[PDB]
Design an enzyme around this catalytic site. Structure first.
Site, PDB file in Angstrom:
ATOM      1  CB  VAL A  38      43.305  38.315  38.358  1.00 33.83           C
ATOM      2  CG1 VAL A  38      44.179  37.048  38.334  1.00 33.83           C
ATOM      3  CG2 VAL A  38      43.796  39.411  37.356  1.00 33.83           C
ATOM      4  CG  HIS A  39      37.851  34.759  40.793  1.00 36.65           C
ATOM      5  ND1 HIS A  39      36.579  34.514  40.342  1.00 36.65           N
ATOM      6  CD2 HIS A  39      37.917  34.233  42.040  1.00 36.65           C
ATOM      7  CE1 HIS A  39      35.910  33.819  41.249  1.00 36.65           C
ATOM      8  NE2 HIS A  39      36.693  33.648  42.299  1.00 36.65           N
ATOM      9  N   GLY A  40      42.249  35.127  41.497  1.00 35.34           N
ATOM     10  CA  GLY A  40      43.135  34.104  42.138  1.00 35.34           C
ATOM     11  C   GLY A  40      43.270  32.890  41.251  1.00 35.34           C
TER      12      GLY A  40
END
EC number: 2.7.1.-
Length: 153
Positions: free
Chosen positions: A12-14
């Site tokens: 997802v990587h924020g």
């Protein structure tokens, strides 16, 4: 139903996942990853990101994604996030019709070579990316929306 598939070692990587999801207009993010899917405590942080920004999320194994992604209802607008090109290749081999695959963060490990600012590959990674292309998928490197798209060498 599937709007985009992104490869990103950070999943997802924020804020990165947030911006992609908003830009493409997805309402359901499917994280296709066996490790995370099978050890649910590893889901918690990414779940908070989904909760925070108001999109749905699922954490599925590759096998499960192949088995069920086709049952997706018309209202579900899906963004697939995969750790590696290996995962994407398994989806393609399993008969999932992907149109576009966005290559995001692929981090260094020993012997890997840099092909873009945030993309390091070994020969297997290139093989697998090229396999995906050969199946008619549009594969491109792009960190975030609006960046110049780059082709696989």
């Amino acid at each position: 139903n599937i709007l985009l598939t992104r490869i990103d070692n950070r999943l997802v990587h924020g804020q990165v996942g947030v911006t992609w999801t908003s830009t493409i207009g997805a309402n359901l993010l499917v994280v296709v990853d066996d490790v995370v899917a099978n050890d649910d405590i590893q889901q918690k942080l990414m779940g908070i990101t989904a909760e925070t920004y108001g999109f749905g999320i699922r954490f599925f194994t590759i096998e499960k994604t192949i088995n069920v992604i086709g049952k997706a209802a018309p209202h579900q607008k899906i963004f697939l996030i995969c750790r590696t090109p290996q995962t994407v290749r398994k989806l393609v081999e399993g008969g999932i019709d992907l149109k576009d695959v966005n290559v995001g963060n692929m981090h260094f490990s020993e012997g890997k070579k840099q092909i873009s600012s945030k993309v390091y590959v070994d020969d297997q990674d290139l093989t697998d990316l090229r396999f995906i292309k050969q199946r008619g998928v549009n594969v491109f490197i792009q960190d975030v929306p609006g960046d110049q798209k780059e082709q696989i060498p």
